Symmetry: D2
Subunit: 388 residues, 4 copies
């Protein structure tokens, strides 16, 4: 009846999303560049809550300290005129040829130091604009060949970089946290910290782990054929879901960055169900690319579609959970038992419990059906709005 | 000239590998069952160091405490007669219908308790036989549909199970460590802790993390299209590579379990180079399946091939690293710089270093070629034994 | 409001689908065997139109000519009592160990001859029961290693087999056509004629091409990451879609055989839209497996779900095409122009047409947006029943 | 001992390969543009036989008929000075924004006509330069969404385009054949005629099928997880392998275009074995991209590596086939029987042959091992130069 977004929904977009000119590895741009100020105004009209940026999206690379000031001021004025917020910022450590072998893990030491300085500079700006999260996507960290990169040394350099950024943030007294964005490949043959799991594990080896979280992207985990909602559940379980990138992907292939809802629709439904059920309160950020076949009217239609699909799925997931028939099916499938401790009675009690082994009727238990197909069809009926 | 394995190479095989009867989802067995005693004798003849087992491989499910004693005694006699060792053992929590929805994370609480008791029983046996590592492969932990499993609750149950096993081991004063074996899918649609990264991250949330490591399998990470050597490098970096399963896999599809060397040959080369360079001293365990097209002579030929390929790759990786031309190429590609700290001088020094940003010549640095293709061709020449 | 199937919908199921006992490569069966007579009765109750079978599903392998007669008679009586039809039949050339290296392309000549005799025998039975289509799924035709199979010779043997079957059918004056079912892998490492394209190309080299078509399966093309609806469109374009296997698959991994609607939901929508738009009049056959987690109530629920999902998607696809707003969007995206000939005026006229090259305004044409995102969102809104 | 290529080896390179500037979807170019004349000279020095080009690689888009003449003349002079040949040419129907929705299958009719005129113009030039094959890679033919393209209409337009090109070639009396290059995806979400199979099937529906063949690329079939050598075997079987694109790819992900030999090494070995065994006499064309990490010395090293790897594999494949031990193993695995007709005796004789069914000992046949693992290890030993 009404799927109109309002800033309360916390939907955000990166400047580079709706601003993508359409240049791909086999073709030239199909759209002219958008001035960040226009993007803010257009996104505000659509019901967006805010925007995000890479340093290089806002301030052209090589800009003087004076041109830099002018670009920030214009942007700040657009934010003030629209009420749009800037909850997240990041660094571009992948476009310029100097980062061809990476930023934080480039083999060249001078490049690694430059990467850190470029990042620190943008952290100051991020804080100025009010960002609460600083994302790091090591797109160029990795290799196409085995001897080019000693991964153990690379991880030492990656840890060193993140520890220094942590030391900087704490010495300046900033209220900002970091979020690592994993991706398995593209543009490098293999990228370091390829999935949410690898990123979470790496974080536990940092000096101040409390300052780091993860920024998973639906399409990235799907490029490894992984179950996105499951990955998000593990991140939440560890208390590390600081931010999230929403989009669509059609299986294992190049990173498509389709609008949210496109790609794996059922996974989108399960993702929304999880985010809403867990009470995730961070931004619902869309990192997508309106296909190069579109003109500007098509880009705004695509962006609007991102928000619309999230809202439709939110309604359907809510109806699913509130349905008494579904609550009954969840009990029939023993989801209630899954939430109860296996042995709150303790180890010794379990060892002495003859009902757990000596007298356990394995055949009777094995004959119990899980009733998962009925439950899944109810989920399907809810998603399609076909409940009879 | 000589690629003959000896027990010093630490090559091991699971009883279920060479003993696989050939039953697959579309066909009946093509080979008769092997008596574990024959397998030990045959493997000892081939130069193997030891064997591994699931409880159910050694003692048929449902066996009485007396039949259990006889099976262990026969096995023990074969080990004594051959000098074969048993460095690792594991539990079968996947074959019996009772584990259709998992063991440690089954929705049914009584099944979870049974899973733990079955495991504890085999841990005692493992220690008796001298195993240093106890592997856990949660093959049935997961789902085919989204509502069937609440992943956060499932992870709570998985943690609970592993913590209890840790409490047991420490209360008995055993000298045994655990290793979690990840797998992304099959037999479940999606399996919990799908990759080495997810497993490493989970371990950091256990009560006694020092007791747990990972047991990665080449084919499993490859089923997610991940770079196995990179994953192993991260495990070593974290000091968690307790054991390893070697085999072959041809890309993203069902788990093939080809003999080691088959599948991705170059990845096999890089894996061996890494294991030997890092000084991994654990067993080189083969978890493979001789294809159902083979008779018994073909199974022993396949097992022998596993060891032969490891030894050939070991020689080639050693020649590669010792080659002065390669050492020169490694420096040309700046691998030496990758190993040097980015900023041992500290944060403040980096911030004040004008050569790192203000006066950094980005164009000059960007113009430096990495020389990675030459290095990779030298690696190729070494692998193929074609160095001119 | 009403998604109840009736025999008019032409929904069919293989005996081996609802009859799958749940045995997978890592576990024993979780359900007892179903008597084909019970399956027919249960499927008739659900609204099914008919069933299909492999010879070995109906007559246990090794059965005497007398036991064979009894099995057929019982089955025939169930068909008569329910009004169920048998539109398709096939041969099991994959379960028995003798077919470990294939049937029609086994390296052993005696096995190939046996494969043909086994097939011919079942063709006679198929005709007797009224089947119009005879499917061939060469599940064991292929290899795990490169030297094991010379593919050119294998294709010669595959052609030889199919030509002989064609000669048999025509000499007996039967009214039956063949349909080749492609699959890229599993149970073999690589299967011959891996996709719909390969199968269509092979057919054009047979002696009587008019007798052969294809029987694509949604999950099989998806195991190669291919777009199923596109593949079906090519089959229809060539006039070769004789039959179709419907199910669900979650990307590139083992063949899941989920119920139809599960897996890639959007692809299911586009498939139904295409089948209904093209006027496909053959059976809507479900080749799926109710997950081993289910008891018998779960299998019937899963089968019912197959039909329900098809009917829901059919309604949504129909609403999409009938929507004036959609018809308007289709014109805005120039689908009408795609259907008009590029050069009905002829080659010479095109060469002399200056508006086609010399005076063609490429920049103006390039600036036209395709309006594909708006069209796709309308499709999404229709699928979810969210049209405002 | 000597892997130096000479023009007799027929190795060719596209101008766009060694000339790739390194621009990818996330970064700017890392190398300056190469003048085609320099590329010809450098490639001739390396032992190459010839080069190939897209119209737009040789003549900048938008060039006047006079600038066009100058570019061709300079190129012609470089060919004369080096003795380099031009065996293949193709059209660029993917870079310019006008082709954003395709060339031959664009929804806009005026674009389709323009695509044909652009192609015809380059065919004339190709003939002038002596090309025997004209390749067509429909990189933009396809879609990202289901409603954007009616595939049946698209195939009608694709057929119409190719038929017109055939009519043109025959009316001009040219001695040139066409080769369709399939690719499953990238840059479009899904590309029409996604694999070698689909392309072969489509060709059989053209007016003059004898004029069309296929130009498969190793990395493209691998992006669908298909077995390249198997696909090539089917193309040869149909007498349609007119040309071939050689490169390397690491599984299912974006198109990497690694140098030949890199990626799947074993598949490269089996490919060379097949091409040399079948007597393929066309060019060995490399369609690869030297990684953006390299400077110009790295690009020439990468190109040289393509040829070197082919020559090493050629030697190893030859040694494998000539090895008496291997010839013996091939007979043990019954490859000789695979080449013998299944029933040269005819249908009736087969039906009356009791040894084929009634008296066939299935158990005895089933017990015969295929000896495939031994054969494969011999292949492995040969590839690695480790034959004892
Ligand atoms: O694949 C590109 C990646 O998703 C990128 O867009 C990051 O999200 C961004 O650079 C960090 O915010
Ligand atoms: O895919 C099967 C898995 O690899 C299994 O064989 C484990 O390795 C074993 O159960 C634990 O040791
Ligand atoms: O992957 C199994 C395949 O789908 C099989 O079930 C065929 O459809 C059947 O044997 C022919 O009808
Ligand atoms: O993926 C790009 C494709 O391989 C292209 O390079 C073609 O080969 C060429 O355009 C035709 O010759
Ligand atoms: Ni992304
Ligand atoms: Ni992405
Ligand atoms: Ni992102
Ligand atoms: Ni395994
Ligand atoms: Ni495995
Ligand atoms: Ni394993
Ligand atoms: Ni199937
Ligand atoms: Ni299937
Ligand atoms: Ni099927
Ligand atoms: Ni290509
Ligand atoms: Ni390519
Ligand atoms: Ni190509």
């Amino acid at each position: 009846m009404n799927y109109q977004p309002t800033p309360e929904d916390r939907f955000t977009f990166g400047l580079w999303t709706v601003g993508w000119q359409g240049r791909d590895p086999f073709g030239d741009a199909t759209r002219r560049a958008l001035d960040p100020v226009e993007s803010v105004r257009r996104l505000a009209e659509l019901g967006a809550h805010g925007v995000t940026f890479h340093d290089d999206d806002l301030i052209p690379f090589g800009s003087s300290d004076s041109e830099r000031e002018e670009h920030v001021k214009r942007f700040r004025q657009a934010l003030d005129d629209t009420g749009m917020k800037v909850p997240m910022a990041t660094t571009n450590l992948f476009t310029h040829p100097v980062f061809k072998d990476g930023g934080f893990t480039a083999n060249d030491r001078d490049v690694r130091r430059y990467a850190l300085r470029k990042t620190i500079r943008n952290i100051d700006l991020a804080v100025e604009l009010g960002a609460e999260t600083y994302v790091a996507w090591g797109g160029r960290e990795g290799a196409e060949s085995g001897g080019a990169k000693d991964v153990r040394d690379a991880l030492d350099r990656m840890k060193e970089a993140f520890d220094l950024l942590g030391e900087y943030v704490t010495s300046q007294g900033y209220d900002i946290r970091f979020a690592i964005e994993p991706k398995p490949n593209e543009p490098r043959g293999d990228i370091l910290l390829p999935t949410v799991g690898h990123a979470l594990a790496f974080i536990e080896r940092l000096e101040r782990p409390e300052l780091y979280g993860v920024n998973p992207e639906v399409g990235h985990e799907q490029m490894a054929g992984l179950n996105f909602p499951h990955g998000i559940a593990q991140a939440l379980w560890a208390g590390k879901l600081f931010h999230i990138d929403l989009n669509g992907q059609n299986g294992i292939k190049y990173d498509q960055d389709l609008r949210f809802g496109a790609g794996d629709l059922r996974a989108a439904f399960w993702l929304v169900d999880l985010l809403e059920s867990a009470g995730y309160s961070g931004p619902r950020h869309f990192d997508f690319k309106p296909p190069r076949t579109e003109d500007f009217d098509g880009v705004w239609a695509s962006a609007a579609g991102c928000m619309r699909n999230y809202l439709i799925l939110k309604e359907r997931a809510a109806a699913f959970r509130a349905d008494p028939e579904v609550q009954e099916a969840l009990r029939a499938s023993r989801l209630d038992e899954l939430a109860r401790p296996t042995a709150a009675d303790g180890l010794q009690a379990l060892l002495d419990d003859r009902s757990a082994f000596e007298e356990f009727d394995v055949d009777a238990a094995a004959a119990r059906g899980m009733a998962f197909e009925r439950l899944d069809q109810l989920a399907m009926d809810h998603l399609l709005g076909a409940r009879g």
